[PDB]
Design a protein around this ligand. Structure first.
Ligand SMILES: O=C([O-])C(=O)[O-]
Ligand SMILES: O=C([O-])C(=O)[O-]
Ligand SMILES: O=C([O-])C(=O)[O-]
Ligand SMILES: O=C([O-])C(=O)[O-]
Ligand SMILES: [Mg+2]
Ligand SMILES: [Mg+2]
Ligand SMILES: [Mg+2]
Ligand SMILES: [Mg+2]
Lengths: 464, 464, 464, 464
């Protein structure tokens, strides 16, 4: 069964009765609540349906809160929605107004003072393109160059233009607080630009008295220039290909994706690949050949997890998308679970032991390898190795089971806190014997202790 | 500049004035004439516009004739086109009729006698799905399971069901003949199943007194079981992902693609990857993140050439598709031109010398590798190696320049037939000096003779 | 300090007062008692002086009993000693006589019935050579071809001629018994030919009620044809180059030596290299350049131990030989301790863990590897790896300390039978702390249990 | 047949009738004339017997002139020869005298002013050892520590003490001149210390109007510190182990030997290994096991050539020594001709092509590699690769055939100068066809031109 994890985004299409349960049963490992849409009641209902489904099926399911970030968007139109056609002049002003088809506002108040002539403006991730003709006082005058649809509050991106905006907006902080009190397991931050951005998130968490892992979404050039620093300061990364393919040339995105996955893996941080993987399944029951290829290739790149966005949140086939994503992942993994070799050589006790434990397990045909861990850190160092052996984490903290839900190839077990190696072994055999694929005699390799011990153990027997 | 080749499909969208010229100027290396659509006049006009554009720009452009093969299609509907909806019963009969919405004919006359209850029927490569309920006399009764649109003569696929049909239909043979007299450079055959299929194509060519390279399109399970035999009997392969993803589970297609490219490269046969690479650009000016990824990944897989089908043949952005495909290819190649290592070890004189010539060229920082060749065979053995050095073929046969247009990384030069090594060197220096990248002093490596010589030569200097 | 072990042979030159002690202090790791010379009183005195010296210095010293085997030798001469000169005819008869210079007896009673015309006869390992002219009744008539000295009972070898003789003679069995009662640690058997030879030694040991490790000396062609079988049935091997270079062409001996060392190492059996390593030091205070090279090369080949024979047993510089041998070994090891890579890949629990333990130790810069073992088996699997880390064996059996004295790189510690992992760790820290260069904080890797545990431990600290 | 070359030293034992011829027929590839012994008439007679034997057998035989260098030696004794015994005081004075047993002169006039108390004095390469007690005025007072024999003019070495002496003495220059006029092919210089030493030899050669290759003998610490510089400035190196093992600790010599051979091979310079390889064959018809091992190990180290000194020059078995040396070399090579991998990567045209030519030859099972060369430079770059293919040099200069006689694996052919590639090929086929084991159809690889061409050619056939 499947090693690569699947992240699904909740929204309108999953609000109907017991669709969230259906997703979990179909293989969803992490549920993303997108704070760009919906109200707090919406998020709250969805959060609870996930907890119920996780508890009712016994599948681990993380809840991931995605903060909107400093997203730049259009203001409001008189008609609600207009149409921008190849040829037209359009004004985007920092001054407030109830925008009309030719004139409209933005949330970015430094637009006029930061846009220059020749700047490109991409709307809704490249559905409509404009070029800046002039900055007159408080207005940015533009000519539509590729036409299409514009609603209220749709997102625009100005490639190249250096944006000045705080990493967390007022909305974000409110939304972060709400999510932390609600009890989410992880937080993603959009439009991350430097390593210092995590410290702002950390300040808010410390104020409220609760921390969780923070995921940096990579969708900005500055993020890619500081990729290593970012992967080190944050707990995980999401390759956010939607905005990444408008903030950067779309032709560069495929190599950036591979570079980020490798960088994450070398540092034992989870990496998620997002956006448009099975885009066409928003309308169609089967994906395109490129979409199947894209998912297969993200698995071979070595991604911990792949994400569905519109495919589950607003589309007509949320369940089939998840099922289809899962089949592709499985088809690839059945053939081989091999990932790109890592170039870094373990110098840390935990790392060194993890390599060794894999070697032993693989050479001895072990049925599984088992790690005890507090924060998951030892398990993540084993996960990046991409062994075909079942990787089984044992922990006392139950929130850690939810956090490891987005780590490659890993199932987690909650157990009471232990005070002897004898304890650990009895514990393991007990926990594992309750599954049908584990019988007395099965050979496993156990890593334990702050980790400093490898133990080759046959289930049931007294080898300790 | 670009090493990977681009194949474009001509049709309605490229018939407008000087669009074919525009494609060639945008980088089209091979033009595919799809005999599933259009009349002989259409093909003839398009063929001539390609010859003109190739001659007027000086870019090599192959013309590839795609034979329809034993495609199974629906017959004709009374109303021309109906709608098949999730729930309905539908009959597909081998008897002739002017089919109505509930009842319709097929071209496959063994349908009733070969279809069985529970058989799936996929229409138009998975836009509509049906399941066989009963075979009553001459009719195949079906229940629509995923609904959508059905026109006249649309293609259906029955996964699993063993088809009995000759590799070349009467239509194919006529179309092959017409194309050979018209003067195409290559021929692709659809729905290839065994190595013996090429012998049928060869019989027709011999009758007419003209041969060209034959490309096996891989879109059938039997083709994949005989992959090695097929790659050896045919001159090239196209991974035809459209039908391949309905004849086989779509989740398996990505690994089949990689396996075929590797198999082609090990045998120095060109491989093309086809269908849905930038599918969304039929309607949109920019592709999806999955589509960009799919193209990038086919280049890294090691494909000689990538193909556009509907993106150029019927869509709204044929030029942009080609330009976009080219940018992605270039973005990938700029980073690296490295392909998957080959596992076979050269035992053939020409092969062994090709490896050696690459080694020399790379270690000496040579500006280019130059091969003389009759059929292109030595050049193809060098092309599969994927060196970053310009690969330059020299030949007397002008049709060979068109055939090498779909071989990785390769530019070809026509020269008069030569009868001394002194001649070859003067020839090379002359041909190469007429370009801007080549100046006196530039170091190149020349392979020559049936090939048995390597010559390290500085342009201009007397070192023969 | 030194990793490669040194075996010394005791005899007349080491019988003077406290020379045995001097050898032990100079680095002798194993003392060989050669039963081809001396009486039981001699062996007994020497054995006791070794036990005393081992106990008084605290250096481990094994005692190795070398059984003469089916050595073929001349009988007795009237004059005691004669001279065989290039040109002369000589008879070697199976009948008893008090041989003169023209006529003399042999111990081999099948000589006449097994020698044929043209057979070569080498005396004293190639000091004198003869050729067989005729077999007349009970005599083998020979022509001296290379002249030199012949005393009574000197050893002859007939290259090629198939010898029929029991692996253990009556003398051997008596000598084996005497040695087993005396309390030697190992036994070497000369002229081994098949794997079944060890079973004969085992029968004698079982009768007497005491087993020790048996070393096969390799000095026969049949031994080299069955090298793998022999290395598996015996506990160790000695490349006995003296007789090996007359039983085989001397030019083949160097590759046979390397092949045997590799074969031993692949199976974690100790290998000793013997005879003429510093031959000239029998007369001279310094060796030849070839001799220094030969010792250096045996270390690089990967030999557990090198042996001195005449250099210590009869020569004028027994102490200097040992000191000189030690300096060369150390000079080589200081540069590097790297041996030829092993080709076999660990499939056994013990083996797999040993590799892993080395990896951990090396990558973590551990001060030492520590193995607990019953028979030494786990330690030998680590020793063949040739790590630069100190390798420290812990055992309850004191005879095992003597047996491991001929295993590469290994020091042994006697300890009471600990009965808990807590025990083992306290035990290790205690034992190791009693030396300088082991201090609190030093990092070591411990292998333990039938072995199934690796434990990375800092000396002193509580991390069990 | 044999790839490794053999150097023999001529002297008293080879002066008897037709022994030089016998050596050449036994496989001598280079004859060393040692100018430390004999008069000019002696050298002259020996030189001519070598030319005759080389011409009469058709075997290439180089003549190598070994210059004594700044050898420090004792003066003359009243009794001619005395005996220095463990215990005695001995004076070695820079003042002239007809030394007696207690008092004697040296050639080194800076002895008293450069020797200090505690200095070791080794005589005749370690046969007698002394320690300096005092420097009184013009005398160096010594205590014998290891006793033995002292003749007139025997060589002493003072390890550590920095010697000041010109690289060429007056005797050397005379001897160099005489040898150059006599027509030797190579020159070796003893006690080389820096790269600048070759420039002094070059000055003398230029004065006299004739150059030959110069071999640096390595027998000094300063030589080993400047090993790379020396290997680059000189044309070849000899590991002169006799003095090297007294100027340096003898235990270090074996690794210095391997380091020098590797350094030579990386720079395509021939390396010779000298002194005491079969030392015992001065008195005995068969060597020791260490001696056989030493020769085998020098071949595996990758030495171009091994040298005999006293074994042929003064001993009782000059012919057998050469035969025995040859058998060992062949025994090793039959198994494999593989040498230690080289770490440098070819960046020079000639080097790069040599690698390539080997690759082609080996992969195509070519019967031979053929190189054309002026100075031998291309051939030496191929020789260091140690391919199992016959390596055949073609040159117009006949002295080059003599110089290549000490280069691994290489036979040379003299041919008239050619002025077309057609010429070269006809030339090769002609030259090679005159041997059995070259027949029409045999495949060879030819390197040619200043080298810039590889040509895979079947003997006889027209494929130019
Ligand atoms: O936010 C995202 O996931 C994106 O932009 O692709
Ligand atoms: O024919 C094709 O290109 C296909 O089916 O994908
Ligand atoms: O017995 C031995 O050791 C030998 O023959 O070398
Ligand atoms: O000069 C030599 O040959 C030596 O010293 O070994
Ligand atoms: Mg985004
Ligand atoms: Mg098709
Ligand atoms: Mg023996
Ligand atoms: Mg010397």
């Amino acid at each position: 069964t499947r090693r690569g994890k699947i992240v699904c985004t909740l929204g309108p299409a999953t609000q109907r009765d017991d669709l969230v349960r259906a997703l979990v049963e179909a293989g969803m490992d992490v549920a993303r609540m997108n704070f760009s849409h919906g109200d707090y009641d919406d998020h709250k209902v969805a959060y609870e349906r996930v907890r119920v489904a996780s508890d009712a099926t016994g599948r681990a399911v993380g809840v991931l809160a995605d903060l909107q970030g400093p997203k730049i968007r259009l203001g409001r139109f008189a008609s609600g929605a207009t149409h921008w056609a190849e040829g037209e002049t359009v004004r985007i002003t920092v001054g407030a107004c109830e925008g009309s088809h030719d004139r409209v506002s933005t949330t970015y108040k430094r637009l006029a003072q930061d846009a220059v002539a020749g700047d490109r403006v991409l709307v809704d991730d490249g559905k409509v393109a404009l070029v800046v003709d002039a900055v007159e006082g408080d207005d940015v005058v533009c000519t539509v160059v590729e036409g299409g649809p514009v609603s209220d509050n749709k997102g625009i991106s100005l490639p190249g233009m250096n944006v000045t905006a705080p990493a967390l907006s007022e909305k974000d902080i409110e939304d972060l607080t709400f999510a932390l009190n609600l009890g989410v397991d992880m937080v993603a931050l959009s439009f991350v630009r430097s390593p210092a951005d995590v410290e702002l998130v950390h300040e808010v968490m410390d104020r409220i008295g609760r921390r969780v892992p923070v995921i940096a979404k990579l969708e900005k050039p500055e993020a890619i220039d500081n990729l290593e620093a970012i992967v080190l300061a944050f707990d995980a990364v999401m390759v956010a290909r939607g905005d990444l393919g408008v903030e950067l040339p779309l032709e560069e995105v495929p190599l950036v994706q591979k570079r980020a996955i490798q960088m994450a893996r070398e540092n034992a941080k989870p990496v998620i690949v997002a956006t448009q993987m099975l885009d066409s399944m928003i309308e169609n029951s089967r994906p395109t050949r490129a979409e199947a290829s894209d998912v297969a290739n993200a698995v071979l790149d070595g991604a911990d997890a792949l994400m569905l966005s519109g495919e589950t949140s607003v589309g007509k086939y949320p369940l089939a998308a998840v099922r289809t994503m899962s089949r592709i992942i499985c088809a690839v993994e059945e053939n081989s679970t091999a990932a790109p070799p890592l170039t870094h050589i373990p110098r840390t006790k935990r790392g060194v032991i993890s390599y060794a434990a894999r070697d032993i397990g693989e050479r001895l045909d072990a049925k599984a390898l088992v790690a005890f861990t507090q924060s998951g850190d030892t398990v993540r160092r084993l996960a990046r190795l991409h062994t075909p052996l079942p990787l089984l984490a044992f922990t006392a903290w139950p929130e850690v089971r939810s956090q490891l839900a987005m780590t490659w190839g890993t199932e987690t077990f909650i157990v009471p806190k232990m005070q002897s190696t004898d304890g650990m072994i009895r514990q393991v055999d007990k926990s594992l014997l309750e599954l049908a694929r584990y019988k007395r005699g099965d050979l496993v390799v156990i890593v334990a202790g702050s980790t400093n011990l490898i133990h080759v153990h046959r289930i049931g027997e007294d080898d300790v």
